[PDB]
Structure 1
Amino acid sequence: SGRIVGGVWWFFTLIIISSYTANLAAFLTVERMVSPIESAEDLSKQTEIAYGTLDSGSTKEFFRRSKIAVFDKMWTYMRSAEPSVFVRTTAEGVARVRKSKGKYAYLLESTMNEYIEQRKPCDTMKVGGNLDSKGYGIATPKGSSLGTPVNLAVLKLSEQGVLDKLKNKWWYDKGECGAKTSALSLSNVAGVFYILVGGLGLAMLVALIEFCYKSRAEAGRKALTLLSSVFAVCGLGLLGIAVSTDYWLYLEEGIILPQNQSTEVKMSLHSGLWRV
């Protein structure tokens, strides 16, 4: 009679534990597969993370006439997409990256990019390398006298390192910030240590109660009869109040308005057992 209750309880704790070890080993090996976007191509395949380009300038015009065919697929997204991936202004385009977490991946020129990651608040960074290779330049008018000494000065300032001392002085030195652990940390299994110490504290607290109860009584029948029928006619009515007054399952049915993700309801429900 009793080795069956001890039987199928044992088999119950072989499946619930081995569906806990074998599921905690399926979080930790599916958020270990998660790779950050570190290339153009690794942003080509992601249909989850969306692209982005300012709506007027050389940056659109690079993709539209591209034949490298990594970029051709990237332009193939940006025409046919909903809603508009094309921001109008680089103040807006940054502000979508700031707001929309991990979704939006604005494409801009590298020297505007490094002066926004080191500028308050540091909420963005540059991944991967350069797609193409432009160049800035000093413009001499057409044939004037200042066309060969400027050209021979911007070679001299490049080699001595003034063009690098000046970049570090404005991108980095007047910056606003600086410059994976692969293991469970105490944040992960935190609540076990709280339920441990919080568990011990309830033991010694009851150990004071245990000490006072059965040692100061040193120096029943009707109580079971009273409390049990109290628990009965309450608990007979507990399920009674439960089986009516229909609040069993709320259902906050809703939709996502993708701008700020804007959770907006569609209906609600409080079905009891036969009353919706």
Structure 2
Amino acid sequence: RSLIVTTILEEPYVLFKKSDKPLYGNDRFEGYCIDLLRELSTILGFTYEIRLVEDGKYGAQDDVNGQWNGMVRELIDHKADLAVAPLAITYVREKVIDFSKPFMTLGISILYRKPNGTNPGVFSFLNPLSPDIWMYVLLACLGVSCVLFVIARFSPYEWYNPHPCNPDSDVVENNFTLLNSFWFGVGALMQQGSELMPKALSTRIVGGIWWFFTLIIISSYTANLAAFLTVERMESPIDSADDLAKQTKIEYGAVEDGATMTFFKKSKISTYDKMWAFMSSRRQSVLVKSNEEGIQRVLTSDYAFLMESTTIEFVTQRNCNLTQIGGLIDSKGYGVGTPMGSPYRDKITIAILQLQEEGKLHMMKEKWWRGNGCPEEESKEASALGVQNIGGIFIVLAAGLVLSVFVAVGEFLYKSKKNA
């Protein structure tokens, strides 16, 4: 004899080969379950010929007559001897056909968009104060220093004798010129002082007020930056279903009429019926029809699509903009199907389990689920301040030293134009 093996088209499962050569038979197919049946027929000795299921399904009761469809109809009507396909071992299907013992473990977990890290900008040190404030601090430096200049020329006490070494007269002068009064204000703003230090009482009230103003500006820059950096460090992305249960900004997802949304119907867990309450409320928006459109929803919007774990690890690892957040929720298992009471059930159970002990079923999964390089290496770290978030203080340093050369040229010419 030759066993009629019913299977379905899926990836990395039974596929077609990508060549032209239009005379294929039993070389037409290539996938995980073709490599599995190649290694089951090798050690059990049988020969096989693959015949795809006609009505493109896995199997379910249509409830109109209690007749199964898909692959498990061909198994229950003995039109097929095996079923090497992702036919998950479940309760209602166990009572009609007999499965082997699992060759793969799956479960419900979450697709999500891999965290696109926010570039802070190069000028991200300006952030702890609003741009209304950074302008009003600059207009306070041009304001107070033009007030201190007027008061220093108007007050008699600031006019001092610069020579205590020689008790003269008529040499009485100020040190607060227009340029020095700017240098007091800029010097006091940066908390590093200057060499002027007012002498009258009226110019010290301008001084002592500008010093109290300055402490509140620096201590509200340091404290708000220590609030921006401890909010960013305290927060964390979703890494579970519980953190996905609370935040209603992140939109959920499931296949309409599938085995994933069926789990949230029959669930009695208090964290999963809340997820069904989200899916029952926002239905027609969080209940997309298949696995293919559900990936395109995560790729565009803030979608959190719930599907099985073996077709996340395929999708995630050939598309490194996508990730798997959380762990396994359910725990299913793919099993090689047999008709009810078949002799090949006990041989394949021993044959699948022989390939696990010699490590075949991991070397086959790493051949088909691995894929390209996919640069995901991507050592994301945080909170150590680098060039990417404090680097614009290097630019305005360099922009201030280019400008100061242009004034040193402007000073060396202006002196020589006075001399000549």
Superposed pair shares fold, TM > 0.5 = yes
Per-residue CA deviation, residues 134-189 of structure 1 (Å, 9 max, x unaligned), is 00011112333432222221111112111100111111145644562431111111
How far apart, CA to CA, are the structure 1 residues paired with 2:369 and 2:249?
Answer: 32
Structure 2 counterpart of 1:52: 253
Structure 2 counterpart of 1:112: 311
SS of the residue aligned with 2:405? helix
How far apart, CA to CA, are the structure 1 residues paired with 2:376 and 2:387?
Answer: 27
1:159 aligns with 2:357: yes
Distance 1:197 1:62, change over 3 A: same
1:127 aligns with 2:127: no
Distance 1:3 1:83, change over 3 A: farther
SS of the residue aligned with 2:383? coil
How far apart, CA to CA, are the structure 1 residues paired with 2:243 and 2:407?
Answer: 59
How far apart, CA to CA, are the structure 2 residues paired with 1:9 and 1:178?
Answer: 53
Question: Which runs of 4 or more aligned residues in structure 1 lie more than 6 Å from their structure 2 counterparts after TM superposition?
Answer: none
Kindly name which structure, 1 or 2, has the bigger radius of gyration based on alpha carbons.
Answer: 2
Structure 2 counterpart of 1:29: 230
How far apart, CA to CA, are the structure 1 residues paired with 2:283 and 2:269?
Answer: 25
Deviation at 1:42, TM superposition (A): 1.8
1:142 aligns with 2:142: no
Distance 1:82 1:34, change over 3 A: farther
Distance 1:203 1:175, change over 3 A: closer
SS of the residue aligned with 1:108? strand
1:203 aligns with 2:407: no
SS of the residue aligned with 1:37? coil
Structure 1 counterpart of 2:386: 185
How far apart, CA to CA, are the structure 2 residues paired with 1:83 and 1:5?
Answer: 67
- Does structure 1 retain, via aligned residues, the 8 Å contact 2:256–2:287? yes
How far apart, CA to CA, are the structure 1 residues paired with 2:340 and 2:388?
Answer: 65
Moved more, 18-27 or 3-12: 3-12
How far apart, CA to CA, are the structure 1 residues paired with 2:369 and 2:300?
Answer: 24
Deviation at 1:82, TM superposition (A): 7.2
Matches within 5 A, 1:1-276: 1-81=202-282, 84-100=285-301, 103-120=302-319, 122-174=320-372, 176-178=374-376, 180-219=381-420
How far apart, CA to CA, are the structure 2 residues paired with 1:175 and 1:206?
Answer: 54
TM score, norm. by length of structure 1:
0.73
Report how many aligned residue pairs link the two structures. 216
Deviation at 1:197, TM superposition (A): 1.1
AA matched with 1:17: I
Identity of aligned residues (%): 54
- Does structure 1 retain, via aligned residues, the 8 Å contact 2:229–2:383? no
SS of the residue aligned with 1:35? coil
Q: What are the ranges of 5 or more consecutive residues in structure 2 without an aligned counterpart?
A: 1-201
How far apart, CA to CA, are the structure 2 residues paired with 1:143 and 1:83?
Answer: 42
Deviation at 1:119, TM superposition (A): 1.3
- Does structure 1 retain, via aligned residues, the 8 Å contact 2:317–2:371? no
AA matched with 2:311: M
- Does structure 1 retain, via aligned residues, the 8 Å contact 2:313–2:369? yes
How far apart, CA to CA, are the structure 1 residues paired with 2:274 and 2:392?
Answer: 46
AA matched with 1:138: V
More strand by share: 2
AA matched with 1:94: I
TM score, norm. by length of structure 2:
0.49
- Does structure 1 retain, via aligned residues, the 8 Å contact 2:240–2:327? yes
SS of the residue aligned with 2:292? helix
Distance 1:211 1:84, change over 3 A: same
Which structure is higher in RCO with an 8 Å CA cutoff and minimum separation 6?
2
AA matched with 2:389: N
SS of the residue aligned with 1:198? helix
AA matched with 2:208: G
- Does structure 2 retain, via aligned residues, the 8 Å contact 1:118–1:177? no
